[PDB]
Write a protein that binds this ligand. Structure first.
Ligand SMILES: Nc1ncnc2c1ncn2[C@@H]1O[C@H](COP(=O)(O)OP(=O)(O)OP(=O)(O)O)[C@@H](O)[C@H]1O
Ligand SMILES: Nc1ncnc2c1ncn2[C@@H]1O[C@H](COP(=O)(O)OP(=O)(O)OP(=O)(O)O)[C@@H](O)[C@H]1O
Ligand SMILES: [Mg+2]
Ligand SMILES: [Mg+2]
Ligand SMILES: [Zn+2]
Lengths: 15, 343, 208, 154, 302
């Protein structure tokens, strides 16, 4: 919508 | 006896090595490929392409040599009776040092293989630069453009009229640069075949699967022949592999014969189902044993000349990614029947 | 990664279209971002199985199933907001309507794959009493079933399952939240002397 | 799904028929029939060469001269056939070279009235003593008239 | 007789193979397309192109050969006092090894099969290959052929540019703008990537009349098949439609495969396993169906 982040599948973990 | 004649025990080691490197074995996969390829050869009947897929070590080269020699021996009475008639022709596609395949090089080398093994016969091609010479080596001038060489090849291949043009290591066609299509490189050979009425059999590893099905025309006038390995899921090919191993052990000119079927798992782990790799390994261990005057082949000799684990994993993954696509099942005809509208 | 999936498909003989759906679900962003709504605590959870953030609409309905799937070995992967399925079903009147629906999770296991939808008690009862041919209860396996979801699963080589919150053991959830910190670690090495000490104290006294 | 009697379909039996040997060169009608303005042999061969898109010297050297059995024809067809060019007058003469040129052009084109193209008909009433020009003779006005009218320049 | 001659059985097997080679089946689609082609040849009606499409194996080349023979045998009462007059010129397009089509190579191959001498000494009489194109033009205007067929016409389609795909056929317009010679372009469905438009349709499964015609041509094939015993093949027509896609040419070549197999085995009739030993693979057949359906849709646009 307006100001809403795209439904991205965020990777996890510390690189 | 089914083994080696024992008189080589006194003969020098070179004769033993020559025997072990010149022995050929017959196994059902090779026989099936041979029969299918020869039956396709006897009549293309519209088909203008043969794709002989294999693996790394199954022995596609030995199959091609056997077939070439077979039609050579077939046509030998006709070759003696009639000249200007080569039964089959063969060429290895060059791996280019440049980024793209050299069509000009392919044409000139094909003309070399079709002309050079022929006596100084007065045949004139419709081109200027390519001509004969006193020594008999027909020379293509460096100023001759590629399509002129292709026209000369067409004239030579309709005059000689061979049965099959074999292109070994045909995967080197796929070594295409810039932004061509891998199908743009096969319409040329399709036109060659459809103009000269010549069957073109292409041999290569699993990468040659990239040309497998590119266009409707490129697949209608084409057949595919698979040089299947010795698998592990199906026990009959395991027994066949054991039979070939027994034959190799029986035809080993050693002083005392070891038993090579008890290490069958270790043999298959470094051969993956390919006969040529097994032959190559056995020749290596034979040479090592014969240099030290060894009377037997032990497991240490087998391990010292075995292939690396990483290599084996490499070829195995290549084989898997190859024949995963090369699988025809009942669903493949069921869905065709459904989509055609017959049901 | 692709070779193992290909062998999975070959072993389970999934059809071409079923393989197409599985491939699409595997490589696709979630269809819709979870909205806060008005009564559901929403959010995201880090999953080391997938290794990504998975979105839950309800922290006490879908999230327990997500916890199970993350700590379940039978499950290989569990995608969230899979692409919409046009479930076709006949209503009470008789008209066969096709409604777009997004399953809560798409679970790929070691012997099967399919859709899993998380709902609550009262939601399931109201939907069943308002739609006779969309949800019903099987007392044999004591499970809730949706006719068009399972029909679409059976036309594609997949399965369809409804996870309610009656069957979730909350003690399991509490203990998973207790030991999740140790689960997320990667090099748990207990000193051998201390481990032997506890092993002796444990074997000397059962039920401690 | 009722099936009636399956009427057998006939055949075609494709077979290319043979035709009489096509002429090596083109076969153009030589303008001037029934007119006191018939064209010439040199004009006809030049027109043939232009229509083929080759130079008349090239056509004489590579298509006519090998077909002529005379020794000098074959020899000069490989070092510059200047003999036939310095004496292009005699190609239109009453004599043997003119008749040979007509015969070779008939062989190449397969016509039936190339003898009327030259005055070889009158080999018994004329004499080549001071009769033929060494250099070309053309009417420019006729050249434009024929070019502007769309007809061929002959 | 309606069957294959009964005197070729005692003849050697290669005679039977040659007889099957020469034999052709004239089914109603072939005769209607032949009638259409002959009518449009007799009266272009302001059309200089006879574009013909159809998936591989449908039989366009055989139709072209039949049309060439019929034109020659119709013009024969005029090829006895007239010379330098070819009734038909047929050519096959060259597949380029370079990125784009070689128009010079096309021109020189045309002059090679037009019996035009002195190709290598053509001089430009004042854009690709001036001398070659003007030689082509003329030749054909002096030769005056009825139709100029080009096979593998889809080979004109590689220019690797969206702004030149319709700028690659203009040479054919120019060749057909000052010679008055008909052009019958034959190719696969890729020729839709470009005048009289003709479709070399198959016999569809959905329609009943097409299935009846397929049964009839298959019966003709099984009756003219040179074996001592007549094989029953209609009971397998479904299978015969599975690896053929309704293209009579593919069925003909495959049936000849089975014929020669039986002749090498001295079989008195063909069986299902003989069909199953030389049967075409499945992936290639799927590619055939996809291509032919795409072409049929692309032509279905109104
Ligand atoms: N069945 C066989 N009988 C005897 N020798 C065989 C057989 N199969 C393979 N060989 C031998 O294996 C050796 C190596 O294999 P080969 O070169 O023929 O393999 P290939 O399939 O052509 O592979 P590549 O060309 O990719 O190396 C050759 O010397 C060949 O003679
Ligand atoms: N009516 C027919 N009767 C007999 N044989 C036929 C017939 N039609 C086609 N064939 C066979 O088909 C082959 C010729 O190719 P065909 O004309 O079928 O292909 P095309 O569709 O015109 O061209 P391409 O497949 O190259 O695109 C020959 O083997 C010929 O015997
Ligand atoms: Mg090799
Ligand atoms: Mg064709
Ligand atoms: Zn004048």
């Amino acid at each position: 919508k307006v100001g809403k982040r795209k439904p991205k599948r965020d990777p996890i973990g510390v690189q | 006896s089914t083994g080696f004649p024992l008189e080589l025990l006194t003969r020098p080691a070179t004769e033993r090595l020559a025997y072990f490197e010149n022995y050929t074995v017959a196994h059902p996969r090779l026989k099936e490929v041979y029969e299918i390829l020869m039956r396709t050869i006897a009549e293309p009947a519209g088909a203008s392409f043969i794709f002989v897929y294999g693996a790394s070590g199954v022995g596609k080269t030995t199959l091609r040599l056997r077939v070439e020699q077979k039609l050579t021996e077939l046509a030998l009475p006709k070759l003696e009776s009639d000249r200007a008639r080569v039964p089959v022709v063969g060429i290895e596609a060059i791996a280019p040092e440049s980024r793209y395949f050299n069509w000009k090089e392919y044409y000139t080398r094909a003309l070399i293989t079709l002309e050079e093994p022929l006596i100084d016969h007065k045949f004139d091609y419709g081109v200027r630069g390519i001509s004969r010479d006193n020594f008999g080596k027909i020379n293509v001038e460096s100023k001759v453009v590629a399509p002129a060489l292709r026209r000369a090849l067409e004239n030579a291949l309709i005059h000689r009229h061979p049965d099959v043009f074999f292109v070994d290591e045909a995967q080197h066609f796929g070594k295409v640069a810039s932004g061509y299509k891998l199908q743009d490189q096969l319409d040329c050979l399709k036109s060659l075949a459809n103009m000269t009425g010549i069957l073109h059999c292409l041999l290569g590893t699993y990468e040659l699967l990239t040309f497998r099905n590119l266009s409707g025309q490129l697949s209608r006038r084409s057949v595919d022949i698979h040089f299947r390995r010795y698998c592990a899921d199906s026990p009959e090919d395991v027994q066949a592999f054991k039979s070939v191993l027994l034959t190799f052990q029986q035809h080993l000119p050693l002083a005392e014969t070891p038993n090579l079927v008890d290490h069958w798992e270790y043999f298959y782990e470094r051969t993956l189902g390919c006969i040529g790799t097994l032959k190559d390994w056995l020749k290596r261990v034979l040479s090592d044993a014969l240099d030290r005057e060894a009377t037997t082949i032990t497991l240490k000799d087998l391990q010292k000349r075995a292939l690396s684990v990483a290599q084996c994993q490499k070829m195995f993954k290549e084989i898997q990614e190859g024949e995963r696509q090369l699988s025809e099942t009942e669903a493949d005809v069921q869905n065709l029947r459904s989509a055609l509208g017959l049901g | 990664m692709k070779e193992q999936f290909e062998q999975w498909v070959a072993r389970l003989q999934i059809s071409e279209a079923g393989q197409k759906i599985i491939e699409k679900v595997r490589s696709s962003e979630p269809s819709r971002r979870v909205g806060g709504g008005s009564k559901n605590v929403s959010g995201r959870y880090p999953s080391r199985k997938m290794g990504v953030t998975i979105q839950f609409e309800s922290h006490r309905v879908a999230l327990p199933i997500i916890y199970q799937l993350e700590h379940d070995k039978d499950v290989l992967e569990f995608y969230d907001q899979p692409p919409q399925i046009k479930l076709d079903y006949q209503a009470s009147n008789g008209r066969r309507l096709g409604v777009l629906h997004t399953p809560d999770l798409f679970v790929i296991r070691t012997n099967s794959a399919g859709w899993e939808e998380c709902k609550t008690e009262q939601d399931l009862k109201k939907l069943a009493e308002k739609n006779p041919n969309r949800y019903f209860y099987s007392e044999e396996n004591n499970q809730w079933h949706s006719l068009p979801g399972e029909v679409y699963a059976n036309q594609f080589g997949l399965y369809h399952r409804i996870h309610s919150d009656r069957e979730i053991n909350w003690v399991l959830q509490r203990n998973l939240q207790f030991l999740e910190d140790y689960y997320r670690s990667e090099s748990l090495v207990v000193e051998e002397a201390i481990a032997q000490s506890l092993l002796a104290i444990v074997s000397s006294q059962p039920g401690i | 799904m009722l099936a009636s009697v399956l009427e057998t379909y006939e055949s075609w039996n494709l077979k290319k028929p043979l035709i009489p040997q096509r002429s090596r060169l083109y076969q153009p009608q030589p303008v001037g029939i029934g007119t006191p303005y018939i064209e010439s042999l040199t004009g006809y061969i030049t027109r043939i060469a232009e229509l083929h898109g080759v130079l008349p010297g090239v056509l004489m050297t590579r298509e006519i001269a090998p077909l002529v059995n005379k020794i000098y024809f074959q020899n000069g067809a490989n070092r510059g056939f200047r003999e036939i060019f310095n004496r292009s007058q005699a190609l239109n003469g009453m004599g043997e070279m003119a008749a040979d040129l007509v015969q070779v052009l008939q062989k190449l084109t397969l016509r039936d009235d190339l003898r009327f193209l030259t005055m070889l008909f009158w080999s018994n009433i004329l004499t080549p003593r001071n009769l033929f020009r060494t250099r070309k003779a053309w009417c420019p006005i006729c050249y434009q008239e024929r070019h502007q009218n769309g007809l061929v320049v002959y």
